[PDB]
């Protein structure tokens, strides 16, 4: 039973809040480790956490890892984004973060910590701003600005600090030290006055993934990714990711959960309370599947509720109503399906003979009011009003949830077991274009005019 909740504060296995704010996960041995920081009462850095788990639902407190008596300087302070990285060769867990005076944000510094073990005390080395001995001056003071930060470990064994300097308009990315703990030199300057904040720094196959997430403060926004096949040069642009708001969160770290079955890239972002007036105590999580489409398409849906088998490997969408459904036509006779049973992104919804075919099977997702999300079983994907089309002729596909107004669908009984079935953006009906009784018959959006082709039946199966 490992499904998760997002937009709340889950709960570990002693009954208790998690807070572990704009953390991060390690996976070593058998365990993963999730890190994070917490504020007080002053809104200042008070320790960062540390929880393990197997199955990535049911989380373990384990202390923190890290205090504000563990150093001087953590006595008073701001601390943000907490990332821990593994070294093969020392056999010790470096922990890197941003640091903060706690009075101002004129300190753009990094810190870094360590421990022989994971969820045993870290001991506190120093903070600083990097390249501070090269004498270069970012802003008046010694060192480029680090802010926004995170890790990143390649197949070569080789360390890899992220962050963003030039008052958060340039990207630094800092090659490390074999030890992890200092930096050897700076790797490359990325996407220079696109101002990017929250990075996250991945692999998958040859390709490096950068996913961001502008720079709008608490309030949540527009998140966008880039790959390139190499760390130093050739990386791309700025693909849009998720939604307008990122599905009211902000990027902190992506995991690949590695199983049985294959690989699931995980990702986690934070729903600041800030948006709303709230102390970051009260900030809820948001943990969502990266898909990759291609080697250059990335997607990541939105769903209510994640299923996760950590021991298969598996992040997949929770369905509420394990019920499936096939939608008949009135006119045609024939049933909803996708065109050629295809899985492809953005696919051609399209009607069909009823073939008992999976691609001609649907689950109902209630979705809030009276509204509901059409998801397929063969896919998995939602229907979808191309490009949110509020116009008659509006082709009908196949999408990735992203909780779009475009996705939600209302039923309206008219008798005998047939509905009109709406959608939540502007009214129109799944409607049959020009009346076809054919297979292959494209699926669309039309006004209500009361025509048979727009009348479609529930069946069960
Ligand atoms: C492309 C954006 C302006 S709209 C975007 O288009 C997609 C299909 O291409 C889906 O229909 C999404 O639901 C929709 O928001």
Same mark, same amino acid.
């Given at each position: 039973?490992?499904?998760?909740?997002?937009?709340?504060?889950?709960?570990?296995? *002693?009954? &208790?809040?998690?807070?572990?704010?704009?953390?991060?996960?390690?996976?070593?041995?058998?365990?993963?480790?999730?890190?994070?920081?917490?504020?007080?009462?002053?809104?200042?850095?008070?320790?960062?956490?540390?929880?393990?788990?197997? /199955?990535?639902?049911?989380?373990?407190?384990?202390?923190?890892?890290?205090?504000?008596?563990?150093?001087?300087?953590? +006595?008073?302070?701001?601390?943000?984004?907490?990332?821990? $990285?593994?070294? =093969?060769?020392?056999?010790?867990?470096?922990?890197w973060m941003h640091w903060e005076n706690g009075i101002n944000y004129?300190?753009?510094?990094?810190?870094?910590?360590?421990? !022989?073990?994971?969820?045993?005390?870290?001991?506190?080395?120093?903070?600083?701003?990097?390249?501070?001995?090269?004498?270069?001056?970012?802003?008046?003071?010694?060192?480029?600005?680090?802010?926004?930060?995170?890790?990143?470990?390649?197949?070569?064994?080789?360390?890899?600090?992220?962050?963003?300097?030039?008052?958060?308009?340039?990207?630094?990315?800092?090659? #490390?030290?074999?030890?992890?703990?200092?930096? =050897?030199?700076?790797? =490359?300057?990325?996407?220079?006055?696109?101002?990017?904040?929250?990075?996250?720094?991945?692999?998958?196959?040859?390709?490096?993934?950068?996913?961001?997430?502008?720079?709008?403060?608490?309030?949540?926004?527009?998140?966008?990714? %880039?790959? *390139? !096949?190499?760390? %130093?040069?050739?990386?791309?642009?700025?693909?849009?990711?998720?939604?307008?708001?990122?599905?009211?969160?902000?990027?902190?770290?992506?995991?690949?959960?590695?199983?049985?079955?294959?690989?699931?890239?995980?990702? $986690?972002?934070?729903?600041? =309370?800030? %948006?709303?007036?709230?102390?970051?105590?009260?900030?809820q999580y948001v943990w969502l599947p990266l898909n990759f489409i291609?080697?250059?398409?990335?997607?990541?849906?939105?769903?209510? *509720?994640?299923?996760?088998?950590? *021991?298969?490997?598996?992040?997949?969408?929770?369905?509420?109503?394990?019920?499936?459904?096939?939608?008949?036509?009135?006119?045609?006779?024939?049933? #909803?399906?996708?065109?050629?049973?295809?899985?492809?992104? %953005?696919?051609?919804?399209?009607?069909?003979?009823?073939?008992?075919?999976?691609?001609?099977?649907?689950?109902?997702?209630?979705?809030?009011?009276?509204?509901?999300?059409?998801?397929?079983?063969?896919?998995?994907?939602?229907?979808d009003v191309k490009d949110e089309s509020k116009e008659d002729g509006?082709?009908?596909?196949?999408?990735?949830?992203?909780?779009?107004? +475009?996705?939600?669908? !209302?039923?309206?009984?008219?008798? /005998?077991?047939?509905?009109?079935?709406?959608?939540?953006?502007?009214?129109?009906?799944?409607?049959?274009? !020009?009346?076809?009784?054919?297979?292959?018959?494209?699926?669309?959006?039309?006004?209500?005019?009361?025509?048979? &082709?727009?009348?479609?039946?529930?069946?069960?199966?």
């Amino acid at each position: 039973e490992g499904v998760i909740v997002n937009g709340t504060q889950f709960k570990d296995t *002693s009954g &208790n809040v998690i807070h572990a704010h704009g953390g991060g996960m390690l996976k070593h041995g058998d365990y993963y480790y999730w890190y994070g920081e917490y504020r007080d009462d002053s809104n200042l850095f008070l320790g960062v956490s540390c929880y393990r788990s197997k /199955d990535l639902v049911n989380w373990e407190y384990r202390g923190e890892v890290l205090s504000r008596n563990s150093a001087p300087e953590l +006595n008073h302070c701001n601390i943000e984004r907490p990332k821990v $990285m593994y070294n =093969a060769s020392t056999g010790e867990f470096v922990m890197w973060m941003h640091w903060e005076n706690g009075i101002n944000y004129g300190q753009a510094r990094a810190a870094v910590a360590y421990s !022989k073990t994971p969820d045993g005390k870290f001991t506190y080395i120093r903070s600083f701003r990097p390249m501070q001995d090269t004498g270069v001056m970012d802003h008046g003071l010694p060192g480029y600005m680090s802010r926004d930060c995170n890790v990143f470990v390649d197949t070569d064994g080789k360390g890899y600090f992220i962050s963003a300097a030039n008052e958060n308009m340039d990207l630094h990315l800092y090659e #490390l030290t074999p030890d992890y703990k200092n930096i =050897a030199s700076l790797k =490359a300057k990325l996407f220079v006055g696109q101002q990017r904040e929250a990075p996250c720094l991945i692999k998958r196959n040859g390709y490096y993934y950068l996913i961001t997430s502008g720079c709008t403060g608490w309030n949540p926004n527009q998140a966008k990714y %880039a790959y *390139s !096949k190499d760390l %130093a040069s050739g990386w791309s642009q700025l693909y849009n990711l998720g939604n307008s708001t990122t599905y009211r969160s902000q990027p902190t770290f992506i995991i690949p959960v590695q199983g049985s079955s294959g690989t699931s890239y995980l990702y $986690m972002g934070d729903r600041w =309370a800030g %948006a709303w007036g709230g102390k970051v105590n009260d900030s809820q999580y948001v943990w969502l599947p990266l898909n990759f489409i291609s080697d250059t398409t990335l997607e990541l849906p939105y769903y209510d *509720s994640v299923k996760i088998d950590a *021991s298969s490997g598996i992040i997949s969408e929770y369905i509420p109503d394990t019920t499936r459904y096939k939608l008949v036509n009135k006119n045609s006779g024939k049933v #909803l399906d996708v065109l050629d049973g295809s899985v492809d992104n %953005a696919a051609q919804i399209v009607q069909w003979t009823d073939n008992g075919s999976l691609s001609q099977q649907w689950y109902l997702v209630d979705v809030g009011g009276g509204y509901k999300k059409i998801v397929n079983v063969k896919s998995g994907r939602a229907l979808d009003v191309k490009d949110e089309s509020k116009e008659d002729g509006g082709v009908l596909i196949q999408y990735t949830s992203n909780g779009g107004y +475009n996705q939600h669908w !209302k039923f309206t009984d008219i008798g /005998d077991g047939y509905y009109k079935i709406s959608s939540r953006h502007c009214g129109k009906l799944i409607d049959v274009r !020009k009346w076809s009784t054919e297979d292959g018959g494209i699926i669309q959006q039309w006004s209500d005019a009361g025509g048979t &082709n727009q009348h479609w039946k529930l069946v069960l199966v």
